[PDB]
Design an enzyme around this catalytic site. Sequence first.
Site, short mmCIF file in Angstrom:
data_model
loop_
_atom_site.label_atom_id
_atom_site.label_comp_id
_atom_site.label_asym_id
_atom_site.label_seq_id
_atom_site.Cartn_x
_atom_site.Cartn_y
_atom_site.Cartn_z
N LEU A 84 0.82 -1.21 0.00
CA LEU A 84 0.00 0.00 0.00
C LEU A 84 0.86 1.26 0.00
O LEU A 84 0.46 2.28 -0.57
CB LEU A 84 -0.94 0.00 1.21
CG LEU A 84 -1.89 -1.19 1.29
CD1 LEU A 84 -2.39 -1.41 2.71
CD2 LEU A 84 -3.06 -0.96 0.35
N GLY A 85 2.02 1.20 0.64
CA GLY A 85 2.93 2.32 0.73
C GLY A 85 4.06 1.99 1.68
O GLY A 85 4.00 1.00 2.43
N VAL A 86 5.10 2.81 1.61
CA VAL A 86 6.25 2.73 2.51
C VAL A 86 6.14 3.90 3.47
O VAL A 86 6.23 5.07 3.07
CB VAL A 86 7.58 2.76 1.75
CG1 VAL A 86 8.72 3.06 2.70
CG2 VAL A 86 7.84 1.44 1.07
N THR B 49 7.07 5.96 7.29
CA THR B 49 8.30 6.53 7.85
C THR B 49 9.27 5.43 8.26
O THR B 49 10.48 5.53 8.01
CB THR B 49 8.00 7.42 9.05
OG1 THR B 49 7.03 8.41 8.69
CG2 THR B 49 9.27 8.09 9.47
N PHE B 50 8.76 4.41 8.93
CA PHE B 50 9.56 3.25 9.32
C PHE B 50 8.72 2.00 9.04
O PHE B 50 7.72 1.75 9.72
CB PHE B 50 9.97 3.36 10.79
CG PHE B 50 11.06 2.42 11.21
CD1 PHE B 50 12.35 2.59 10.76
CD2 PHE B 50 10.79 1.38 12.07
CE1 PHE B 50 13.36 1.72 11.15
CE2 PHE B 50 11.78 0.51 12.47
CZ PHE B 50 13.07 0.68 12.01
N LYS C 20 7.33 -1.13 5.91
CA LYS C 20 6.58 -1.27 4.66
C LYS C 20 5.19 -1.83 4.96
O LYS C 20 5.06 -2.78 5.74
CB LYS C 20 7.34 -2.17 3.69
CG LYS C 20 6.63 -2.48 2.39
CD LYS C 20 7.46 -3.43 1.53
CE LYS C 20 8.76 -2.77 1.08
NZ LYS C 20 9.86 -3.76 0.93
N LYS D 66 1.88 -3.63 8.65
CA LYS D 66 3.15 -2.92 8.66
C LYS D 66 4.24 -3.92 9.03
O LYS D 66 4.15 -4.58 10.06
CB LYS D 66 3.14 -1.73 9.63
CG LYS D 66 4.45 -0.97 9.64
CD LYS D 66 4.29 0.50 10.00
CE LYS D 66 4.06 0.72 11.50
NZ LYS D 66 4.71 1.96 12.01
N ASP E 9 4.11 13.77 12.51
CA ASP E 9 3.96 13.62 11.06
C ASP E 9 2.57 14.03 10.54
O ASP E 9 2.12 13.48 9.53
CB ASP E 9 4.31 12.21 10.60
CG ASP E 9 4.93 12.19 9.21
OD1 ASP E 9 5.21 13.28 8.67
OD2 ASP E 9 5.14 11.08 8.65
C1 992 Z 1 11.30 0.01 3.68
C2 992 Z 1 11.46 -1.40 4.21
C3 992 Z 1 10.68 -1.87 5.27
C4 992 Z 1 10.85 -3.16 5.74
C5 992 Z 1 11.76 -4.01 5.18
O1 992 Z 1 11.93 -5.32 5.67
C6 992 Z 1 11.04 -6.28 5.14
N1 992 Z 1 10.46 -6.15 3.98
C7 992 Z 1 9.71 -7.30 3.83
C8 992 Z 1 8.86 -7.75 2.83
C9 992 Z 1 8.18 -8.97 2.94
C10 992 Z 1 7.31 -9.42 1.78
C11 992 Z 1 8.00 -9.53 0.60
C12 992 Z 1 7.42 -9.92 -0.60
C13 992 Z 1 6.07 -10.23 -0.61
C14 992 Z 1 5.32 -10.14 0.60
C15 992 Z 1 3.99 -10.51 0.26
C16 992 Z 1 3.98 -10.82 -1.10
N2 992 Z 1 5.21 -10.64 -1.57
C17 992 Z 1 5.65 -10.83 -2.94
C18 992 Z 1 5.94 -9.73 1.82
C19 992 Z 1 8.39 -9.76 4.09
CL1 992 Z 1 7.58 -11.27 4.23
C20 992 Z 1 9.24 -9.31 5.13
C21 992 Z 1 9.91 -8.09 5.01
N3 992 Z 1 10.77 -7.39 5.81
C22 992 Z 1 12.55 -3.57 4.13
C23 992 Z 1 12.42 -2.28 3.62
C24 992 Z 1 13.26 -1.82 2.49
O2 992 Z 1 14.19 -0.99 2.68
O3 992 Z 1 13.02 -2.28 1.33
#
Ligand code: 992
Lengths: 298, 183, 453
Positions: free
Chosen positions: C14-16, C18-19, C21, C37, C131
């Site tokens: 949906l969006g990224v 502040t801290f 995803k 989140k 924010d």
């Molecule tokens: C901004 C940011 C926030 C959090 C972050 O850490 C994580 N990103 C994730 C994404 C997922 C994820 C990835 C792919 C997915 C889903 C569902 C379908 N698809 C195709 C969930 C998971 Cl399971 C755990 C995560 N932990 C990384 C970043 C970043 O810097 O990219």
Amino acid sequence: SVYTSFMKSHRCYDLIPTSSKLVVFDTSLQVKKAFFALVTNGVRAAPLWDSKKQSFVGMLTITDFINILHRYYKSALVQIYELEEHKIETWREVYLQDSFKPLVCISPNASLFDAVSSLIRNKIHRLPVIDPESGNTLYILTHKRILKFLKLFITEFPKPEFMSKSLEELQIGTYANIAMVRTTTPVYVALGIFVQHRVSALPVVDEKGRVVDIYSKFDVINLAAEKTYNNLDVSVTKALQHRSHYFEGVLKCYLHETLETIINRLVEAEVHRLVVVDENDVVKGIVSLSDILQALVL
Amino acid sequence: ARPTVFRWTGGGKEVYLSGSFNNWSKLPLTRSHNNFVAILDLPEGEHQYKFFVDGQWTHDPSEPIVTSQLGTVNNIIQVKKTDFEVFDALMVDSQKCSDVSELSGPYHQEPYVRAPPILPPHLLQVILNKDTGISCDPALLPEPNHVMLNHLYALSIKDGVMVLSATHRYKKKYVTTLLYKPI
Amino acid sequence: GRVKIGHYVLGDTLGVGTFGKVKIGEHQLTGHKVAVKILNRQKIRSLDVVGKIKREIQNLKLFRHPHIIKLYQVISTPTDFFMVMEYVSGGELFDYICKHGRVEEMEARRLFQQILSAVDYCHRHMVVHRDLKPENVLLDAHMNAKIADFGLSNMMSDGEFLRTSCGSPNYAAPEVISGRLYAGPEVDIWSCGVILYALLCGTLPFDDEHVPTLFKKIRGGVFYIPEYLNRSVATLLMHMLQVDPLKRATIKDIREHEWFKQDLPSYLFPEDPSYDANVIDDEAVKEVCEKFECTESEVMNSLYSGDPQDQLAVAYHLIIDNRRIMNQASEFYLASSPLKPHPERMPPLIADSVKKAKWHLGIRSQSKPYDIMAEVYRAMKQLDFEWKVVNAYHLRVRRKNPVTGNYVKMSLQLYLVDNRSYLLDFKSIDDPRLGSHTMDFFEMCASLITTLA
Ligand SMILES: Cc1ccc(Oc2nc3cc(-c4ccc5c(ccn5C)c4)c(Cl)cc3[nH]2)cc1C(=O)O
Ligand SMILES: Nc1ncnc2c1ncn2[C@@H]1O[C@H](COP(=O)(O)O)[C@@H](O)[C@H]1O
Ligand SMILES: Nc1ncnc2c1ncn2[C@@H]1O[C@H](COP(=O)(O)O)[C@@H](O)[C@H]1O
Ligand SMILES: Nc1ncnc2c1ncn2[C@@H]1O[C@H](COP(=O)(O)O)[C@@H](O)[C@H]1O
């Protein structure tokens, strides 16, 4: 009955203001300076901190002022030396003497019942609330504060039967040996009456015995505010003239008047007692917050 | 269920996950914009795994590796009971943060060896200089701002006494204590 | 081939925030939508913000307000935290304004009343959002506003200020863009001022393509008020967009303003008729389950789904009734502002044998700041104070009280007040028992003050 369990339900904490100021004196402070600090900060009592004992050892009130004046005053022609020289610590050594008289306090989490009990058992008008976990003093509890708090809740419970009974029928208050002063009585004599009979106020009466004014212990501190404490030969009347333009008269009650009527009159007027009179204003007695709170816990 | 995340961030067209849990068979991963992820239910204990990206075994740089007796290198992750309760996980994570902070203090008497911060205006609202309506109890004060609490206020020394004051919270209520101390 | 977390299939981002995803998730049985989140654990440790996340989780978990996005559960994994939240389908308030141009007065006021309700709810819980902006206000299908992203928020601690400058400049108050210390509830209200302005006019009050120019416009605080807005709401804007943080409107100011009171629902604020019957009081649910031994979830279940005469419910409602009686005598708990005199009012002290002394904050000195600190270090050495250095101008001091055996702690901070004159501020620290914590703090300050000159 019901007002008793109300007192047992609420901790003293609930009476504490949201925001309030509290004045503390170190015991080594000069006692004259401390009475002035009461006037300038607008409060009538202060907790007493002993920095050697690192403990709260008691309270300084206007009664201390009355006691120091009555004992050491001699004439308008000479200074009262012990009022200028005494530290609180040395005055307490003289005044307290044989009486154990330790510090009476109450926890914020103790019931209101325990507060009224403490007030009556020790015959005091100020119970300092000390938090046992921080050791800090929080607020100075009084009878007025307890009664006004109860008045807030009288609509929340079924009202008892004695609330509608007359002052005559319940025999609440003091109807005999009323301590009074005449209109011409000098201040120093009134102070002596305060010391001998321990009572908060003296009704002021004319020659035929009807009350024209009231001299509370509170009004004695005007002696400090005006620095007129060095002449106590003046009359109670002259001592109250500063009050004459905003004074609306003496709050009284009759004996046929209901106890609920009395409670509302005192809570609204925020004074400590009413003068019970007859048709002609001649004084038949006193009803005090002491009597009223005591009767509600019996 | 004990969900464990396997995420590959390094791009590529097709990514599979292989490890001890699936007997080293290729599990197709779901792709987001970049991430390739799978969330598996795994028992606690050690698990070995490897990513297979576009026809090639490739190790995860984010996790530790282990070499077997015949020379194959796998990542290993540790599934711990503390991972599945969030406050247990935060307690573990806050312990690992205090651990790194040791290898990067006590009370002491030694002085220190760029202007001071500007004074914020809220501290110049002095609650004891404010007047209160004469109809109320002279001990009542206005409600303080949370930010002025615990700060010291004073009057100029005069006639050998110093007066200090501060406002302190007790539960939901506020007390402003004055102390008259001879100097 | 689906990614499931605790019964929910994860969808697109949906969006990224502040801290972390935010991805949508859909219940694999009922289709119910949520917003998840995701927080990476290793990210949290590398930034040493573990404590700020834990406190942020404890707080958002007990936040129940109709205009704040609710947190349902937190699911923990070895590498990541998943925060399952309420999903709303209306998208951003920012997209609503953009696509409608302006917003009609009756709808703009409704939204603003809801947003301000959630802000007041945060502040009364000692949280400042920081924010606040139309991109972080979400709508549900019914056009109800929801504040969302708390990544930048912070607890408001007694005696402490906030520095951190982050967020969109356009919604930033003049003090945050300057780098000054602020209390933080004043900064949220400024943002509600910009949101209100963006609601009524389709534009920002302070905007420029050149960022240093934007900062001069905000600091000056001059903005254009169109003539299609009436004057009452014009007054409300200038009160909220006031440049002096001490002259800026508070929440109580806004709630008393005539344009805000009109058509205001009774449930949005605590002093109002319907609040108690709707918004749960988290201190009374903690009190009832102190008396009875039970979880906060049981007390809330008898209120929501239960019979009124339940004992958990009658206890709860009884506390709320008592607290109404006490709140409705404010005169008794709080001093008024400047009538027959209270009988205990004291006359002023008269001259000598009178001037009203003025309290000041801490100690003022005109010596150079490095010279002030050296005299502080010297005075403490003489007095047997042990201390730690937060920075050059900030010290954490302690001394063992010889009688009680307790340690007493204090924070010293040096400030710039006038041009070349400075002030030293004294702040107590805390962490049956003889003595008094407050006296200990006064006697410790008193010792230090005398030694200086
Ligand atoms: C901004 C940011 C926030 C959090 C972050 O850490 C994580 N990103 C994730 C994404 C997922 C994820 C990835 C792919 C997915 C889903 C569902 C379908 N698809 C195709 C969930 C998971 Cl399971 C755990 C995560 N932990 C990384 C970043 C970043 O810097 O990219
Ligand atoms: N809480 C207390 N503990 C000990 N002594 C007290 C207390 N309150 C009052 N006193 C004493 O009672 C005198 C005045 O009593 P009061 O009628 O309460 O003003 C003072 O001079 C004190 O010595
Ligand atoms: N002026 C007075 N003369 C005689 N008795 C009094 C007087 N004032 C109060 N009392 C009684 O003394 C007790 C406590 O009085 P107070 O000092 O008002 O708390 C109560 O029983 C009062 O009725
Ligand atoms: N019954 C009364 N009628 C008129 N004034 C009173 C009465 N009782 C107390 N006061 C005044 O109220 C102030 C506080 O007295 P107290 O009730 O002792 O706290 C003093 O100025 C008293 O003279």
